[PDB]
Design a protein around this ligand. Structure first.
Ligand SMILES: [Ca+2]
Ligand SMILES: [Ca+2]
Ligand SMILES: [Ca+2]
Length: 94
DNA sequence: CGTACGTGCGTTTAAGCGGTGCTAGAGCTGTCTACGACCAATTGAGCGGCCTCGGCACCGGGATTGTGAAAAAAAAAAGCTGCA
C-alpha cells in the first residue's frame, strides 16, 4: 500500500524483547526504571553481564523512538519507562 | 532477596637483596665576642581597697509559633473476578 507504507516490522533482538517482557512483567505503576529492569534482567542465564546493561540502554532508546515504549520523566538516570504500545497504531507510522 | 565480598587459581610485577660508587651534609673542633646573668639604685605600673550607677536578671503581659486532634480527601493498596 503506497511507498514507505505497510512496512516489514522486523522482530526486535533478544535484549529489546527482555526490556519489554521485564517492563510488562513488573509494570503496574507510574514507570519502570533502567536500574530496576536490570536488577532481575540479569537473572536470565544467557544475559551477558559485562555488556547487557548497555544493550538494555540501546533497546530502551530505540523502543521509545519506535513509540513501542514511553518515558514518564526519561532524561538520563531513573527515566522510568512504561510500554505506551497499548493505545497506538501497533503497525507503525512515520 | 540481591549481590558484595571471600576464595582460589594463573599471570604479572616490582620488592628485596647484595653490591658498588659518589659525595651531601652530619657533626666535630677550636676560636672569639655578642649577649645574657647578676647587681644596685631608681621609680612608676599594677596591686588591693573602695565607691557608683547602669547592665542585666527577673517579672508580667501580649504577640507569635508550632503541635496534635479530628474530619475529609487523595492515593496506594489489596482482594476479587472471569477470560484467554
Ligand atoms: Ca542489599
Ligand atoms: Ca656545616
Ligand atoms: Ca580594681
Amino acid at each position: 500500500k503506497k511507498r514507505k507504507n505497510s512496512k516489514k516490522k522486523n522482530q526486535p533482538g533478544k535484549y529489546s524483547q527482555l526490556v519489554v517482557e521485564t517492563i510488562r512483567r513488573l509494570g503496574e505503576r507510574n514507570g519502570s526504571s533502567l536500574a530496576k529492569i536490570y536488577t532481575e534482567a540479569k537473572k536470565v542465564p544467557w544475559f551477558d553481564q559485562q555488556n547487557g546493561r548497555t544493550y538494555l540502554k540501546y533497546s530502551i532508546k530505540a523502543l521509545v523512538q519506535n513509540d513501542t515504549l514511553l518515558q514518564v520523566k526519561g532524561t538520563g538516570a531513573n527515566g522510568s519507562f512504561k510500554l505506551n504500545r497499548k493505545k497506538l497504531e501497533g503497525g507503525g507510522e512515520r
